[PDB]
Design an enzyme around this catalytic site. Structure first.
Site, PDB file in Angstrom:
ATOM      1  N   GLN A  54      51.811  32.940  28.732  1.00  0.00           N
ATOM      2  CA  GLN A  54      51.377  32.568  29.430  1.00  0.00           C
ATOM      3  C   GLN A  54      50.815  31.242  28.542  1.00  0.00           C
ATOM      4  O   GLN A  54      49.882  30.264  27.462  1.00  0.00           O
ATOM      5  CB  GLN A  54      50.016  32.751  29.643  1.00  0.00           C
ATOM      6  CG  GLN A  54      48.613  31.547  30.250  1.00  0.00           C
ATOM      7  CD  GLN A  54      47.783  31.122  29.226  1.00  0.00           C
ATOM      8  OE1 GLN A  54      47.146  31.748  27.869  1.00  0.00           O
ATOM      9  NE2 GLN A  54      47.294  30.293  28.979  1.00  0.00           N
TER      10      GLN A  54
ATOM     11  N   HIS B 285      41.188  31.258  39.324  1.00  0.00           N
ATOM     12  CA  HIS B 285      40.524  31.610  37.470  1.00  0.00           C
ATOM     13  C   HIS B 285      39.838  32.990  37.690  1.00  0.00           C
ATOM     14  O   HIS B 285      38.665  32.822  36.824  1.00  0.00           O
ATOM     15  CB  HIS B 285      40.608  30.284  36.268  1.00  0.00           C
ATOM     16  CG  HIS B 285      40.862  30.692  35.008  1.00  0.00           C
ATOM     17  ND1 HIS B 285      41.710  30.241  34.434  1.00  0.00           N
ATOM     18  CD2 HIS B 285      40.410  31.872  34.106  1.00  0.00           C
ATOM     19  CE1 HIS B 285      41.837  30.873  33.037  1.00  0.00           C
ATOM     20  NE2 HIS B 285      40.422  31.780  32.956  1.00  0.00           N
TER      21      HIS B 285
ATOM     22  N   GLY C 178      44.080  41.247  37.115  1.00  0.00           N
ATOM     23  CA  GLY C 178      43.262  41.163  35.644  1.00  0.00           C
ATOM     24  C   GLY C 178      42.883  41.921  35.598  1.00  0.00           C
ATOM     25  O   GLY C 178      43.045  43.240  34.572  1.00  0.00           O
ATOM     26  N   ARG C 179      41.450  41.978  35.903  1.00  0.00           N
ATOM     27  CA  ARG C 179      39.863  42.804  35.172  1.00  0.00           C
ATOM     28  C   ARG C 179      40.685  44.286  35.228  1.00  0.00           C
ATOM     29  O   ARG C 179      40.618  45.274  34.685  1.00  0.00           O
ATOM     30  CB  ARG C 179      39.273  42.680  35.847  1.00  0.00           C
ATOM     31  CG  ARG C 179      38.703  40.748  35.816  1.00  0.00           C
ATOM     32  CD  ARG C 179      37.359  40.886  35.786  1.00  0.00           C
ATOM     33  NE  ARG C 179      36.458  39.237  35.947  1.00  0.00           N
ATOM     34  CZ  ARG C 179      37.148  38.368  37.361  1.00  0.00           C
ATOM     35  NH1 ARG C 179      37.542  38.024  37.918  1.00  0.00           N
ATOM     36  NH2 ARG C 179      36.159  37.336  36.780  1.00  0.00           N
TER      37      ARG C 179
ATOM     38  N   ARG D 161      42.754  44.939  44.288  1.00  0.00           N
ATOM     39  CA  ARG D 161      41.878  46.172  43.647  1.00  0.00           C
ATOM     40  C   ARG D 161      42.784  46.884  44.518  1.00  0.00           C
ATOM     41  O   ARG D 161      42.284  48.471  44.229  1.00  0.00           O
ATOM     42  CB  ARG D 161      40.406  45.913  44.036  1.00  0.00           C
ATOM     43  CG  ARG D 161      39.557  45.127  43.416  1.00  0.00           C
ATOM     44  CD  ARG D 161      39.631  44.781  41.740  1.00  0.00           C
ATOM     45  NE  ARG D 161      38.820  43.420  41.187  1.00  0.00           N
ATOM     46  CZ  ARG D 161      39.718  42.336  40.576  1.00  0.00           C
ATOM     47  NH1 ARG D 161      41.413  42.061  40.401  1.00  0.00           N
ATOM     48  NH2 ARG D 161      38.924  42.188  39.599  1.00  0.00           N
TER      49      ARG D 161
ATOM     50  N   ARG E 159      30.464  29.728  31.537  1.00  0.00           N
ATOM     51  CA  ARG E 159      29.634  31.428  31.881  1.00  0.00           C
ATOM     52  C   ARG E 159      28.500  32.435  31.003  1.00  0.00           C
ATOM     53  O   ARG E 159      28.233  32.069  29.870  1.00  0.00           O
ATOM     54  CB  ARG E 159      30.642  32.107  30.789  1.00  0.00           C
ATOM     55  CG  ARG E 159      32.536  31.599  30.147  1.00  0.00           C
ATOM     56  CD  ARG E 159      32.833  32.397  32.032  1.00  0.00           C
ATOM     57  NE  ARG E 159      34.641  31.049  31.794  1.00  0.00           N
ATOM     58  CZ  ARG E 159      35.510  31.515  31.482  1.00  0.00           C
ATOM     59  NH1 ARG E 159      35.319  32.903  30.428  1.00  0.00           N
ATOM     60  NH2 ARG E 159      36.205  30.392  32.320  1.00  0.00           N
TER      61      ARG E 159
ATOM     62  N   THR F 238      48.856  27.391  32.593  1.00  0.00           N
ATOM     63  CA  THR F 238      47.531  27.294  33.481  1.00  0.00           C
ATOM     64  C   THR F 238      46.420  25.706  33.155  1.00  0.00           C
ATOM     65  O   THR F 238      46.811  25.100  32.387  1.00  0.00           O
ATOM     66  CB  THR F 238      46.138  28.003  31.600  1.00  0.00           C
ATOM     67  OG1 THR F 238      47.323  29.663  31.955  1.00  0.00           O
ATOM     68  CG2 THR F 238      45.341  28.499  32.645  1.00  0.00           C
TER      69      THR F 238
ATOM     70  N   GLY G   9      40.643  38.982  43.078  1.00  0.00           N
ATOM     71  CA  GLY G   9      40.103  40.186  43.338  1.00  0.00           C
ATOM     72  C   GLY G   9      41.518  41.467  43.785  1.00  0.00           C
ATOM     73  O   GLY G   9      40.608  41.979  44.785  1.00  0.00           O
TER      74      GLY G   9
ATOM     75  N   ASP H  61      45.791  35.854  42.358  1.00  0.00           N
ATOM     76  CA  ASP H  61      45.442  36.295  42.458  1.00  0.00           C
ATOM     77  C   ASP H  61      44.206  35.893  42.609  1.00  0.00           C
ATOM     78  O   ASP H  61      43.598  35.413  43.433  1.00  0.00           O
ATOM     79  CB  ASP H  61      45.471  36.045  40.716  1.00  0.00           C
ATOM     80  CG  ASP H  61      44.853  35.012  39.731  1.00  0.00           C
ATOM     81  OD1 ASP H  61      44.034  34.142  40.462  1.00  0.00           O
ATOM     82  OD2 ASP H  61      45.209  34.540  38.571  1.00  0.00           O
TER      83      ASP H  61
HETATM   84  C1  LIG Z   1      38.365  38.763  30.559  1.00  0.00           C
HETATM   85  C2  LIG Z   1      39.408  37.332  31.123  1.00  0.00           C
HETATM   86  C3  LIG Z   1      40.322  36.611  30.149  1.00  0.00           C
HETATM   87  C4  LIG Z   1      41.091  35.386  31.086  1.00  0.00           C
HETATM   88  N1  LIG Z   1      41.855  34.681  29.906  1.00  0.00           N
HETATM   89  C5  LIG Z   1      43.189  33.791  30.584  1.00  0.00           C
HETATM   90  C6  LIG Z   1      44.069  32.423  29.884  1.00  0.00           C
HETATM   91  O1  LIG Z   1      43.572  32.825  28.417  1.00  0.00           O
HETATM   92  N2  LIG Z   1      44.748  32.229  30.359  1.00  0.00           N
HETATM   93  C7  LIG Z   1      44.825  32.141  31.730  1.00  0.00           C
HETATM   94  O2  LIG Z   1      45.644  31.469  32.464  1.00  0.00           O
HETATM   95  N3  LIG Z   1      43.903  33.233  33.134  1.00  0.00           N
HETATM   96  C8  LIG Z   1      43.151  33.484  31.989  1.00  0.00           C
HETATM   97  N4  LIG Z   1      41.963  34.953  32.996  1.00  0.00           N
HETATM   98  C9  LIG Z   1      42.412  34.448  33.878  1.00  0.00           C
HETATM   99  C10 LIG Z   1      43.587  35.300  35.268  1.00  0.00           C
HETATM  100  O3  LIG Z   1      44.688  35.152  34.351  1.00  0.00           O
HETATM  101  C11 LIG Z   1      42.917  35.894  36.441  1.00  0.00           C
HETATM  102  O4  LIG Z   1      43.778  34.425  36.409  1.00  0.00           O
HETATM  103  C12 LIG Z   1      41.754  36.482  36.933  1.00  0.00           C
HETATM  104  O5  LIG Z   1      41.350  37.399  35.740  1.00  0.00           O
HETATM  105  C13 LIG Z   1      43.354  36.892  37.824  1.00  0.00           C
HETATM  106  O6  LIG Z   1      42.008  37.707  38.481  1.00  0.00           O
HETATM  107  P1  LIG Z   1      41.390  39.001  38.516  1.00  0.00           P
HETATM  108  O7  LIG Z   1      40.421  39.475  37.303  1.00  0.00           O
HETATM  109  O8  LIG Z   1      40.522  39.504  40.313  1.00  0.00           O
HETATM  110  O9  LIG Z   1      42.705  40.332  38.723  1.00  0.00           O
HETATM  111  C14 LIG Z   1      41.333  35.833  32.374  1.00  0.00           C
HETATM  112  C15 LIG Z   1      40.330  35.901  33.411  1.00  0.00           C
HETATM  113  C16 LIG Z   1      39.998  37.125  32.500  1.00  0.00           C
HETATM  114  C17 LIG Z   1      38.838  38.787  33.378  1.00  0.00           C
HETATM  115  O1  LIG Z   2      38.748  32.702  31.466  1.00  0.00           O
HETATM  116  C1  LIG Z   2      38.978  32.855  30.021  1.00  0.00           C
HETATM  117  O2  LIG Z   2      37.879  33.481  29.439  1.00  0.00           O
HETATM  118  C2  LIG Z   2      40.541  32.358  29.478  1.00  0.00           C
HETATM  119  O3  LIG Z   2      41.073  31.381  30.733  1.00  0.00           O
HETATM  120  O4  LIG Z   2      40.611  33.261  28.120  1.00  0.00           O
HETATM  121  C3  LIG Z   2      39.166  30.181  29.078  1.00  0.00           C
HETATM  122  F1  LIG Z   2      38.510  30.710  27.829  1.00  0.00           F
HETATM  123  F2  LIG Z   2      40.400  29.843  28.202  1.00  0.00           F
HETATM  124  F3  LIG Z   2      39.209  29.467  29.991  1.00  0.00           F
END
Ligand SMILES: Cc1cc2nc3c(=O)[nH]c(=O)nc-3n(C[C@H](O)[C@H](O)[C@H](O)COP(=O)(O)O)c2cc1C
Ligand SMILES: O=C(O)C(O)(O)C(F)(F)F
Ligand SMILES: Cc1cc2nc3c(=O)[nH]c(=O)nc-3n(C[C@H](O)[C@H](O)[C@H](O)COP(=O)(O)O)c2cc1C
Ligand SMILES: Cc1cc2nc3c(=O)[nH]c(=O)nc-3n(C[C@H](O)[C@H](O)[C@H](O)COP(=O)(O)O)c2cc1C
Ligand SMILES: Cc1cc2nc3c(=O)[nH]c(=O)nc-3n(C[C@H](O)[C@H](O)[C@H](O)COP(=O)(O)O)c2cc1C
Ligand SMILES: O=C(O)C(O)(O)C(F)(F)F
Ligand SMILES: O=C(O)C(O)(O)C(F)(F)F
Ligand SMILES: O=C(O)C(O)(O)C(F)(F)F
Lengths: 334, 334, 334, 334
Positions: free
Chosen positions: D125, D229, D283-284, D264, D162, D153, D262, D260
């Site tokens: 990424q 995101h 993600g989460r 789950r 946030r 991204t 949610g 992406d």
């Molecule tokens: C703590 C955290 C950090 C993230 N950091 C990035 C990132 O550095 N780059 C990016 O493209 N998306 C980032 N995302 C977004 C995830 O790639 C994803 O789009 C989002 O978490 C997907 O949803 P989900 O968490 O509901 O599964 C981040 C998400 C979270 C929760």
């Molecule tokens: O959602 C995140 O925390 C992230 O994608 O890493 C940021 F910081 F770049 F926005």
């Protein structure tokens, strides 16, 4: 005295062990489809007709060559001895006395021949098994015992993920067995093998796609049950009540179209018929009544449902079930 | 001092015995149609007009040959002595003094001739009885006593299933009787017999299907009330407010179209008129006011409703009820 | 430090006397239109654009011949000394320093000439009065003092029914007065009299019907505010945000179209602009900031809103407000 | 034993410091888009097919020239050492062993070359940086280390607001760093510079507008991720799942379309594929599993998801992911 089906759920929750109540009440996954069966019915409102002749309101229907006293049958529910020591015999006796068809299950805890001997012109629910010959032998046994229809369950290639059962570590007590004696995915070929092996009407239970309802008619089915298996199979499957009108239009009288999932009153029966169902199945409430009070409990449930169906039909201007099918509905918000 | 109709409900709940409050408040079955009457109004929003002449805002209407002070009448509510010792006389006196029509019930706890003698140009609500001749005698009595319209209730072939009343074991106290003295299903033939027996306008109360509204006009009705009987009859019947616009379009001025169910403010009256109603009926709130404070309570309720109707009309740019009927609405989410 | 507008509401609720908080927070009737202003915005989702040039994101607009730093003005709110001893002067100074227009009210608790002397190119909100000549004198006073637009409030032929104020027995303290010194219904004739009496743009505040927006353009208005008066006038009036897109299409650039009601973040400003608004008004939050911390509180609110508007625009791919107006939206469920 | 992904969230909430749990769980602003990602999936119901051959159900897909064991990849999540001391290495090892692609982040807390050395054919990424040359050097590093796709991204011209992090005063502990070593808005020119600098497929993550999906195909993207995101960027941005069907139709097979936000459960994966997704990101939940139990926790999560995907596909009649993409859906109410 019970004045609604919800009185019976409260009574059954008091008596049953928690893990058996959970086996009965639960669905698969997050239980989204279980909840949606209720939400979907709650959103349907009937547009009643007034000033029609109600001299001789009748709730009877003819289905699969038999008169039934209500547009309802007892759904197949496995292992009824979990809920009361008389299990299937108690329910089948009450259904017979009420004039309602009872569906004998492949996973019955009393043998299908014993339950058929109660009388009442019963149906038989089939699971397709890894050993095909066992499934076809069950069909022949059911026919020889006097069952009137084969309800082929088509939505259980395997059992869904029952998280309550997993969390409870639920298993059958030693005193409950599959008394007719594993699942194999059934296909359209299996349907044809059953149709070739019996003279009885074959009813496919668990249809939700319009194309599968059409194909069921083309395959020679005498009926379908539009159903998501009470939210116990695919979590996220649409409620049957949300597909029913489209399915009724597509088959255009080519087979009987039943529905189940969440029917909890005579008013709900009326909604299903106004959406075009030939009849409903009722599952969990019959087991609540069995748990609460055995055969007499089931009798009281069926008398209450008969009263509620008659009341709802007449309040809506319908002297017959056919008239109820011609009612219109409106979706609302709850 | 009461500033909303909800203040009166709180007051009535304090004073009345629980089982009488439940008789008044309750609906049939699960009370889905009772709740839906409120939900349906809450989803309707008015699109008000601005900058119109409001020199002479009037809330009056002409209906059934009489001027009324508001586009509202008191709905028929049986057995008003349940709520206050003066019962129907207290309500009828307050309605007369407010210029609002009062509907005398077949099941009134004071005789219809006594209530008519209060004055105020009243209406008379008819139930069709097993003995037809009794129903037609009631019509003639009402006409001879000076009632101005016959409100034929068409949605009670029998009473719905009132679970609160069943659970409470509710029955009339010995001191409350049907002072005009069982239900028979009415039909279109009954409507014609009434129409032939009287010169008064016949209003069919309890119409929800568009075709039944059309047939009511063809049958010679002077009006209909679009109504699910306050959610007391078919549980799952659509709210009248959800059918009103379609019904107003279908009859296209051939009779007066009233609505009831859940009207709880002048703003709700405005919504009903913007959906095309000629007038509303109000039921439970009138009884809350009677329970809380007798005749004076009803007077205060009607003064509050008159103020709220005037306020809502003027805020929406309407100098007359006819202008309010030309307002547009938008469904929203609540 | 405040990180959202909701932090300011919590702070204002702590400091203000309950009856003054209720005067500020409340709406008319059941507060259905007050709540619906928030629900309607919560249902709107923006479809953001990506990968656009954001070298020079600007939140500025040109409106009524002046550049403004954000697509926002402070809504007219009567009697600001209720909230802080510096009242209107504190708010006007903060708005001037933020580059945001401030609307001086007819019911200001400091005279309009004093507030105009703060600078910042202010607007003036007019109520039509029983004595017409007083209203026209106010317009001339505002113009002579340097106000830039006349915001003619068209939705208050009289004040709505404020049940919180009735229940609290709310009245102005002796130390708060209408320092410019009763309501008369305004009409289209009143609009024309104002338009003839001034060279300033006339903005009609409180339009919700599409036809009234069209007529406003035909009448020579320079703008309209699509608004239900923060749910304080007709209870059951549609939210402005629900009429905005239809109104923007109907006037097709013939005047500026502002919206108000429930704007509580920069993201909400973005939603309003994506639905076609030229700018928003913000009412209650400005008063929360004034109550919480006086002029500095208002400054902090406006800095926070500016940051949120810039953030939302850039995250949605918009280097200018015009680009934000070309965003698409989708209604969702909450 | 974990039987749902929600068991892992409960476990992670127990172990993590509150401010780190909030960094992980939180979204921007009011968190409207965070919540809407779940609401939008909950409203989608699948219409399953019955009676199909399930002899050889396979959950595999081919994407970006590699077979993957499920239609899923681990989403990019910055700073995984916040959740467990082994951070990215633990997750990447579990993803490799499960046959699932893992997305190495520009803000990884272990260098991208170390994580790539775990094996498993990973993706990379990219954030566009103020120093462009640094971004292009990262791309070349990722390619030289064996990454298989560049996930650019496109929805972070800067980080969203946030509020949990602001309120907590959250900052990285001294022991967590960006081990590959500020944001610059990326544009379509940046996309072209990346496409020219690499032979790997370029996937644009954060597309929501249909026109931007079309332009991504025209720009030579090999895929897009339809995404808001995780509700962390524009508060009020539409959920990706609500745009997915329209976007799949508009690109009409010109690139892979992932989604992406949610996801789950396996049932949610099925919904996304039935709406036309080629694959999902998660993600989460992956971070919950990492926090709860390190590498073994991630392994258990991926085994559970694989079981749920297989279960849902077969219950819906799908022997392959392609068949799942041909399922129909119905929106319902929750
Ligand atoms: C703590 C955290 C950090 C993230 N950091 C990035 C990132 O550095 N780059 C990016 O493209 N998306 C980032 N995302 C977004 C995830 O790639 C994803 O789009 C989002 O978490 C997907 O949803 P989900 O968490 O509901 O599964 C981040 C998400 C979270 C929760
Ligand atoms: O959602 C995140 O925390 C992230 O994608 O890493 C940021 F910081 F770049 F926005
Ligand atoms: C405990 C339980 C066991 C069941 N067992 C079977 C079964 O063996 N075969 C079958 O076709 N359906 C079975 N069903 C599904 C029912 O036939 C019916 O589709 C579902 O319960 C209907 O919904 P209702 O319970 O909401 O009325 C079962 C349902 C329950 C609750
Ligand atoms: C306690 C009670 C008794 C009623 N009795 C009658 C009746 O005898 N005849 C009739 O036509 N409607 C009767 N109704 C129905 C009302 O006329 C009216 O349709 C319903 O109450 C209107 O709704 P509202 O109560 O929500 O205003 C009764 C309603 C209540 C609450
Ligand atoms: C306490 C209060 C007083 C107001 N006084 C006036 C007024 O004198 N003139 C007017 O046109 N609007 C008045 N408004 C309406 C506002 O200008 C605005 O339309 C409404 O507050 C906008 O919504 P918001 O408060 O949700 O941001 C008032 C609003 C409030 C809350
Ligand atoms: O729902 C049930 O419990 C069942 O139908 O019997 C099974 F187990 F086959 F799936
Ligand atoms: O709603 C009522 O209580 C009634 O209308 O009087 C009845 F009883 F006839 F149905
Ligand atoms: O909303 C207000 O309080 C007002 O606009 O000032 C009033 F009083 F005129 F209606």
């Amino acid at each position: 005295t019970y004045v609604s089906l919800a009185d019976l759920e409260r009574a059954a929750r008091d008596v049953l062990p928690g893990e058996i109540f959970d086996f009965l009440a639960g669905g698969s996954g997050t239980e989204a489809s279980l909840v949606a069966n209720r939400t979907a019915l709650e959103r349907v409102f009937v547009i009643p007709r007034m000033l029609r002749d109600l001299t001789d309101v009748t709730t009877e229907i003819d289905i699969f060559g038999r008169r039934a006293a209500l547009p309802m049958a007892v759904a197949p529910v496995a292992y009824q001895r979990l809920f009361h020591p008389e299990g299937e015999l108690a329910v089948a006796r009450a259904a017979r006395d009420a004039g309602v068809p009872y569906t004998i299950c492949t996973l019955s805890s009393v043998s299908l021949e014993e339950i058929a001997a109660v009388g009442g012109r019963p149906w038989f629910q089939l699971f397709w098994l890894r050993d095909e010959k066992r499934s076809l032998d069950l069909v022949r046994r059911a026919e020889d015992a006097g069952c009137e229809a084969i309800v082929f369950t088509v939505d259980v290639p395997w059992m869904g993920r029952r998280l309550r059962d997993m969390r409870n570590g639920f298993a059958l007590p030693e005193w409950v067995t599959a008394a007719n004696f594993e699942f194999a995915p059934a296909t359209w070929e299996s349907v044809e093998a059953v149709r070739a092996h019996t003279d009885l009407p074959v009813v496919l239970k668990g249809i939700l796609a319009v194309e599968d309802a059409r194909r069921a008619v083309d395959a020679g089915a005498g009926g379908i049950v539009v159903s998501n298996h009470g939210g116990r199979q695919l979590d996220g499957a649409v409620p049957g009540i949300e597909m029913l009108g489209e399915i009724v239009a597509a088959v255009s009288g080519g087979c009987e179209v039943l529905v189940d999932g969440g029917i909890r009153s005579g008013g709900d029966v009326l909604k299903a018929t106004a959406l075009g169902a030939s009849a409903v199945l009722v599952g969990r409430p019959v087991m609540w009544a069995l748990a609460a009070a055995g055969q007499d409990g089931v009798r009281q449930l069926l008398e209450l449902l008969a009263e509620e169906v008659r009341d709802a039909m007449g309040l809506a201007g319908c002297e017959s079930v056919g008239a109820a099918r011609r009612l219109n509905t409106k979706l609302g918000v709850v």
